[PDB]
């Protein structure tokens, strides 16, 4: 695979999202790190699919709602940023106020 | 020109009269003072203030600070004030107004070409924590503690060995030497404790001369009156501190017998509540004495629903005589009253190394909720309670171990060990940890990203934790004897060296905001704690702040 | 499209051009297989190989560099040799030369 | 004896006339020359050539190389040739024919008992990359860059501090000293840049004397004509380079005013296109001047569908004046024409540290696709375009910063910083990264496996990155003044030291294969870029090579 | 007072007559002797024996040990006995009865204030393993080996280079010097091997003078009679060992010709069975000679169902002449008989670095199952077989390479490299690995936990593996010549140095419990191995102990 | 668990395979690292099941077809190798031309 440091680092984010994904499935209100991990992983997969940065900046705001997270969590996450390899190389996706 | 207070707060951080909630607790601090001159605040960035001829002057390196933390909200034992912090030569240069004297008024912290900037507007800055009950079971504890905001670790051990598993002791010259050498690799200031359990003074003098800054008396090695007396005699001679974990079994005598052996000499009682060790069930009465500097370990802070249950097995007939709901509940209140002066971990030996700061604030939160405002409190804020509690893991531990001349608080001349916090994560996850003027660790996003913020963001060691830079930014504390004998040169220690002093003259009255000596009693049968006949107790929390909202596991 | 693919131009490469060569019939009289590499001094190969050692003096196998010829027990075959170049100083092998020639 | 060309290629790698596709791009290189003697190629292994008395001689260590890279396909600014590479004493000894003179003809690289072998047949070997726009935001950037094939990093910073987040500046003697000490721990060659924004020359001389090899003028610290002039005056005096990030706000003047301040003195303009900073919207016109060495940062390379969208937020009224589709499209073409001479990252400050090499090749690919063959191109191959582009991150950055006497290309006498690539992964994931003659990092499989190839295979540090071995295989660049004042001995730097020289005499005409000075203009309203009245533009890519086929995320 | 033997075993570990199963194998050891005085055993803990005035005396540091391993069950080549182990100054001080002479009888290991304690009751303690066939392909191999219980690694290499991939050779003075410097960073004792393939003695003397403790003759560099003779001549001169990987191709001659070249001089034959390299198909006959010290690499240990299948590709006409079911089956038996004296890995070059100990025990298990008790065995236990096998990776490798004066067994005066095992995980996953008196690595649970045992528990480096502490607890072996020339001071090596001696005088008769010289023959056509005309063979295992019950993958 | 370095290293491979497994499920054509990770993990589980080296060397060639991976990927993977603990200890499994 010849995994570079950044590829291995992203594996950490992916695994953190798996934790969050299973807890959301149980019907738990997600906390701060779980929310950040879940939305971030969603975006990385979107980039793998070939979605545009513009499309993901919007879609990323509809992953979790205020009723699915603990109190105060939406305010602790003014935005989420993550980079992934799009068909046209690495791009930064910034999702503002992802949780409403 | 005018600006609304809300817009101002968003731009430069809060000012006089503004209040800030500490993380998700019910504790609120109010800015007591602001050392700025409205309109002359320094801000860094494109088109901002800190630029050549403007907020940045023409002075040479010698005439300006190396680092300035702009618009910081300082929370320390002496006050909660808004100001710029200047750092020079790895030490706190001044707390005041930064800028360029050529065009700005009231400048006390000169910014020049040689000045680096850390934007602290909207952030809370505190001194680095000091944990004095470390079991050196593994080197990984250092990074864990640093990440939590603890910059100085005092303790003993040689690794995952039976002796260290149970006691904070680095036995003998050989191990002391090896551990001092190993210390150069850790990004925190370190001081070691030797084994104080022996009735031959020379066996103790040897250890102090080798490098330890204190001696630990632990019952596992025999906390007998003879051993206690011997350790204190050498301590008075060599100006080092003694830490005590008394005879829980009451084998050699009761608490009064131990107190008698101590004979009014200065001593630091570890986990004074008792669960972590000590005369069953009244070791807690020690906090009434003037020569005792009492501390608590953190698993009992604060009293919660699961506390008792988990403690039985972490322990495992004298189990139910050591684990007592009565003394555990009283301990929280005694902290709130200032009867207990320090908080510590007791790392991997009935204590959590990364939860010293976190648990101290949870106790303050629970006490405010249960007891309301403190008698010393003024205004509609919790400023005094905050000053009383922050002192428990900063200045008080430093005073107790004779290192307050180097660290322990944000005061001029002290080593620049500072922790920057975002209010929403105060006491839980710091934004930046500075060791001796250099950032040692901080949360960092994708290394290959276009900016440092993209995920995943996790704590990674910075330049202040690397090789020689680390050596220059950390301190290894030695006893006066070791320093004199040239131990540093002999072992070829590469880090900066500091010497401990003033361990024998410190007393309860010197503990900042925590000098109470209560008329405390413990019922031998019921274990009920009473101060002046009044029952001291509290209720166990079912849910606590600084918990599930911040941690992934 | 194949990442890092080659576009080798057709043809052949002539090896060791302009060097003296000679063919010798070799027979493996041993009971175990013997394999000889391209640059080994042929005159000093395993004694079980029967051939005119005198003719192979200063020679090696005229085969692609890095390749080898195998001789199973009792196997007889003719090989082409090419003369050593450079200083033509032979050192090592079975220690029979240890000097020029 | 004869052998087919295909079998030959499979055995020793391609030869004269053969073509190789670079990774999954449309770029094809053709072997221009082969320094071997057919039939005398050296191959290592059981029963192969490199053995006692055969391909390996009887010479003593002094008379043979320490390392030989066999059958390598060299791609450098001077040529694309097949040859053996000899390394001795950490430096490039010779490029020629390896072997034993006792029995082989034309041997120029003697192999002896003291010679280690790296089989390079079928591999492409290039010099290590040189990134001159590094923000030292975190130490982890070094490993990321090394893994990508970058062996020298020039920049400034003190860690994740506001000043460093925005600028490549290591402010003052104290921080400069600390960072030089920290550099000994990193596996890449390092040179530091100080803060050049000041109108007092002595404040600059102090920094140069402390160790920096250059000064960065950044608008965040005030890119005023007075500061620019002052920095250049000191640069001419001390033979150090100046890097510039101009006044985007046009506060002190327009681009012509800045150019006027520079006064024809040598200067390196960072991200000359403008998006990363500079006079809005015509900083790009700087590439027309003889004294300007222009470079690009990598987020704009190449122009793609998502480029503009991502740039707004990575930035965030002057946003739409800084981010311009017009100048971003023209930049790619200007690189293809040789008007822009270097590529860099701008690590974690609008740039990706591990994508300098990768993005340079993506631009070359896109330009071939859109513009076809270059006017200088001969034969049905892209050899010249490849030489023009590889020079952008190897020799040109070295010349610009006065370190070309040590690194920058595969030439005799230079430090042996080499990168071995498999054609299928060229520019993306290297097979081996050599620092000063020792392998510093390489992909490595299961440690407990019977061979080094089983999964998982990922980059892990090797012996060249360990302690003292690392110190011997890396270089810390110092200014002539610092070297003279004995800074290395004072700070007790353990790595090899090199001094920069020739920074003031280098000009656009010296940039290898990239010396074009076009008559370029920018329309103030439309932002259209024109060279000799002709419009310069290109189309955004929807998909790029060296992307999704190689990365897990 | 009396106590049942079961309660006693649970409290202090087994005693004389008690048997213990080694992991999940069918091997059982029986305690042969116990050096304690029933009732006077030392136990550490609250209210236990090791306390001031009780089990701990009043002696000064010089008069007591630094570390004591209490109630250990020692398994070594000389015996399987229960005793306390004393360590002083990083070396084994004594094996006997620990305590305080003031109140206890028969004390030979004095415990004082300077004594650290490691509770070994219920644990098995062995010397650290010694692997003499290491390919330094990557530095990560050191931690892998250390975790498995190997504390000394002898081999050669420069990293992931072709030469090292195939041979255990560190070519020439430059690479030898660089690797010696890199060795200071690894937590294991290290000795290097140079390239012995050359017919010019001076080219060899240079390497020995540079630091190598041996020379490796590998067919890849030409294992010709001339090279072999030359290497042995220099070896006899400089007192260093020669390791051999013979001519598999039979190019320069057959096995008898190689044996003739050796001329009765001392030599260590690597992977004597043949699969890993050597004269096809009879290199195995070498174990009949008095001057040959034969070892096996581990992929062929033991013979199992998948052995042959995996070996073809790990190898890939001479494949089926090298991989032989006949010789592979016989090898196991030859080990059981003591004809083969050592086991090694052949790390990442047809060998698993973390499976040397594990595989040695699997062979012993399979041999007991197939052959029953050994002729030397007494009692209903496998004590002798255990002594014979443990010697293969401890004392015998040390003797073979002239380092037995420093390491190799638990004997007074030797470096304190010890491995503590829980019986259930013996040979698989150790509880503690001690390097020179300090714990270097051990399994460690949650760092932030209240105790060191909570999950996840995985191996993490301890204080003995950190910086200067590591340097003091490890040894770099040098040749007598290198030591004399002052190589350590020149390269500025920081670790403790040891010199090899006695390499030329060791012979087969000196191999502890493995001195058999069988009249062994190999059929040229069938490859059948026969000792005295009897066929030597064994059956392939379908399932083995120390496998799937312990590993996650 | 007392996880050794090699056990922890294999956890990295397992996690990389999880990434690939989910993308294949979405109907994406796998890239180079995803393919290597997926086939490798398959083999490790086969060893855990107790399958022979010979059986896995063949089965490993039927995990992914040329139509399930990106262009050029089959040619970038001439073979895949991985070791795992079989009932009879650690063994190396080499799958030649795994993607056809
Ligand atoms: Ni205690
Ligand atoms: Ni404790
Ligand atoms: Ni810039
Ligand atoms: Ni920049
Ligand atoms: Ni071998
Ligand atoms: Ni080997």
Swiss-Prot record, chains A, F:
According to the UniProt record heading this chain, what is the dependence of activity on pH? Optimum pH is 7.75.
Q: Which GO terms describe its molecular function?
A: nickel cation binding; urease activity
The UniProt entry, under Pfam families, shows: Urease_gamma
What is its subcellular localisation? Cytoplasm
Q: Which GO terms describe its cellular component?
A: cytoplasm
Q: Which reaction does it catalyse?
A: urea + 2 H2O + H(+) = hydrogencarbonate + 2 NH4(+)
Per UniProt, the enzyme's principal EC class comes to hydrolase
| Notes on activation and inhibition | The apoenzyme can be activated in vitro in the presence of nickel ions and carbon dioxide, which promotes carbamylation of 'Lys-217' of the UreC (alpha) subunit.
Q: Which UniProt keywords apply?
A: Cytoplasm, Hydrolase
The pathway is: Nitrogen metabolism; urea degradation; CO(2) and NH(3) from urea (urease route): step 1/1
**GO biological process entries:** urea catabolic process
Q: What is its main location?
A: cytoplasm
**UniProt-listed Enzyme Commission number(s):** 3.5.1.5
Question: Which family is this sequence assigned to?
Answer: Belongs to the urease gamma subunit family.
Q: How does it assemble?
A: Heterotrimer of UreA (gamma), UreB (beta) and UreC (alpha) subunits. Three heterotrimers associate to form the active enzyme. The apoenzyme interacts with an accessory complex composed of UreD, UreF and UreG, which is required for the assembly of the nickel containing metallocenter of UreC. The UreE protein may also play a direct role as a metallochaperone in nickel transfer to the urease apoprotein.
Entries under HAMAP family matching the protein:
Urease_gamma
The protein here is known as: Urease subunit gamma
Its lineage reads: Bacteria, Pseudomonadati, Pseudomonadota, Gammaproteobacteria, Enterobacterales
UniProtKB/Swiss-Prot annotation, chains B, D, E:
Provide the residue positions that the database annotates as binding Ni(2+) 2.
216, 245, 271
User: Per the record, what is the consequence of mutating residue 218 to A?
Assistant: Reduces activity 500-fold and increases KM 1000-fold. Resistant to inactivation by diethylpyrocarbonate and iodoacetamide
| Alphabetical list of InterPro entries matching this protein | Amidohydro-rel, Metal-dep_hydrolase_composite, Metal_Hydrolase, Urease_alpha_N_dom, Urease_alpha_subunit, Urease_AS, Urease_asu, Urease_asu_c
Q: How does activity depend on pH?
A: Optimum pH is 7.75.
Q: Which SUPFAM superfamilies match?
A: Composite domain of metallo-dependent hydrolases, Metallo-dependent hydrolases
Specify the effect of residue 322 to Q.
Reduces activity 10000-fold, but has no effect on KM
Q: Select a single GO molecular function from the record's annotations and give it.
A: urease activity
**Complexes and interactors:** Heterotrimer of UreA (gamma), UreB (beta) and UreC (alpha) subunits. Three heterotrimers associate to form the active enzyme. The apoenzyme interacts with an accessory complex composed of UreD, UreF and UreG, which is required for the assembly of the nickel containing metallocenter of UreC. The UreE protein may also play a direct role as a metallochaperone in nickel transfer to the urease apoprotein.
Name the record gives this protein: Urease subunit alpha
Q: Which gene encodes it?
A: ureC
Curated annotation (Swiss-Prot), chain C:
Domain of life here? Bacteria
Q: How is its activity regulated?
A: The apoenzyme can be activated in vitro in the presence of nickel ions and carbon dioxide, which promotes carboxylation of 'Lys-217' of the UreC (alpha) subunit.
Instruction: From the UniProt record, give the pathway where this protein acts.
Output: Nitrogen metabolism; urea degradation; CO(2) and NH(3) from urea (urease route): step 1/1
The chemistry this enzyme catalyses reads: urea + 2 H2O + H(+) = hydrogencarbonate + 2 NH4(+)
What outcome is documented for mutating residue 41 to A in this protein? Reduces activity by 30% and reduces thermal stability above 50 degrees Celsius
Pfam families to which the protein is assigned, alphabetical: Urease_beta
Please describe the quaternary structure of this protein. Answer: Heterotrimer of UreA (gamma), UreB (beta) and UreC (alpha) subunits. Three heterotrimers associate to form the active enzyme. The apoenzyme interacts with an accessory complex composed of UreD, UreF and UreG, which is required for the assembly of the nickel containing metallocenter of UreC. The UreE protein may also play a direct role as a metallochaperone in nickel transfer to the urease apoprotein.
Q: What is this protein called?
A: Urease subunit beta
Its gene name is ureB
């Amino acid at each position: 695979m010849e995994l570079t440091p950044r590829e291995k680092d992203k594996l950490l984010l992916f695994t953190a999202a798996l934790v969050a994904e299973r807890r959301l499935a149980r019907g738990l209100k997600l906390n701060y790190p779980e929310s950040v991990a879940l939305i971030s992983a969603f975006i990385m997969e979107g980039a793998r699919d070939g979605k545009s940065v513009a499309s993901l900046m919007e879609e990323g705001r509809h992953v979790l709602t205020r009723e699915q997270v603990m109190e105060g969590v939406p305010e602790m996450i003014p935005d989420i940023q993550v980079e992934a390899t799009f068909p046209d190389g690495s791009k930064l996706v910034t999702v503002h106020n992802p949780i409403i | 020109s005018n600006i609304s207070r809300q817009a101002y707060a968003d731009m430069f951080g809060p000012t006089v009269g503004d209040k800030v909630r500490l993380a998700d607790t019910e504790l609120w601090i109010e800015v007591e003072d602001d050392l700025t001159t409205y309109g002359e605040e320094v801000k860094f960035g494109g088109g901002k203030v800190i630029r050549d001829g403007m907020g940045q002057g023409q002075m040479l390196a010698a005439d300006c600070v190396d680092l300035v933390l702009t618009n910081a909200l300082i929370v320390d034992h002496w006050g909660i004030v808004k100001a710029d912090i200047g750092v020079k030569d790895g030490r706190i240069f001044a707390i005041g107004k930064a800028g360029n004297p050529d065009i700005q008024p009231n400048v006390t912290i000169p910014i020049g070409a040689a000045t680096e900037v850390i934007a602290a507007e909207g952030k809370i800055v505190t001194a680095g924590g000091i944990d004095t009950h470390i079991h050196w079971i593994c080197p990984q504890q250092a990074e864990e503690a640093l990440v939590s905001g603890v910059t100085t670790m005092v303790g003993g051990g040689t690794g995952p060995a039976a002796g260290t598993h149970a006691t904070t002791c680095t036995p003998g010259p050989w191990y002391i030497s090896r551990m001092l050498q190993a210390a150069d690799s850790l990004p925190v200031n370190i001081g070691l404790l030797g084994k104080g359990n022996v009735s031959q003074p020379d066996a103790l003098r040897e250890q102090v001369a080798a490098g330890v800054i204190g001696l630990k008396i632990h019952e596992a090695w025999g906390a007998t009156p003879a051993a206690i007396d011997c350790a204190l005699t050498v301590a008075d001679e060599m100006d080092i501190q003694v830490a005590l974990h008394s005879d829980t079994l009451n084998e050699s005598g009761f608490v009064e017998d131990t107190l008698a052996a101590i004979g009014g000499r200065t001593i630091h009682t570890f986990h004074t509540e008792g669960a972590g060790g000590g005369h069953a069930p009244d070791i807690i009465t020690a906090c009434a004495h003037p020569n005792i500097l009492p501390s608590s370990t953190n698993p009992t802070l604060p009293y919660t629903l699961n506390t008792i249950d988990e403690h039985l097995d972490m322990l495992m007939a004298f189990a139910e005589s050591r684990i007592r709901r009565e003394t555990i509940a009283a301990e929280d209140v005694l902290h709130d009253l200032g009867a207990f002066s320090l908080t510590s971990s007791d790392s991997q030996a009935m204590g959590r190394v990364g939860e010293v700061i976190l648990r101290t604030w949870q106790v303050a939160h629970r006490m405010k909720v249960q007891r309301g405002a403190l008698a010393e409190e003024t205004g509609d804020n919790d400023n005094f309670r905050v000053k009383r509690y922050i002192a428990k893991y900063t200045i008080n531990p430093a005073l107790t171990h004779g290192i307050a001349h180097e660290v322990g608080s944000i005061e001029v001349g002290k080593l620049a060990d500072l922790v920057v916090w975002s209010p929403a994560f105060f006491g839980v996850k710091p934004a930046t940890v500075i060791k001796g003027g250099m950032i040692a660790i901080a949360p960092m996003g994708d290394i290959n990203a276009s900016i440092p913020t993209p995920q995943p963001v996790h704590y990674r060691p910075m330049f202040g934790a690397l090789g020689s830079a680390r050596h220059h930014c950390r301190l290894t504390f030695l006893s006066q004897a070791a320093a004199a004998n040239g131990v540093a040169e002999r072992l070829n220690l590469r880090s900066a060296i500091a010497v401990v002093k003033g361990c024998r003259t410190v007393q309860k009255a010197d503990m900042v905001h925590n000098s109470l000596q209560p008329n405390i009693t413990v019922d031998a049968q019921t274990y009920e704690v009473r101060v002046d006949g009044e029952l001291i107790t509290s209720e166990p929390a079912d849910v606590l702040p600084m918990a599930q909202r911040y941690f992934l596991f | 499209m194949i990442p890092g693919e080659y576009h080798v131009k057709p043809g052949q490469i002539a090896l060791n051009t302009g060097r003296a060569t000679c063919r010798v019939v070799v027979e493996n009289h041993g009971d175990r297989p013997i394999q000889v590499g391209s640059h080994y001094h042929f005159a000093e190969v395993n004694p079980a190989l029967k051939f005119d050692r005198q003719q192979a003096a200063g020679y090696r196998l005229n085969i692609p560099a890095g390749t080898a010829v195998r001789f199973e027990p009792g196997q007889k075959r003719e090989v082409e040799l090419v003369a050593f170049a450079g200083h033509r100083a032979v050192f090592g092998f079975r220690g029979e030369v240890m000097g020029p020639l």
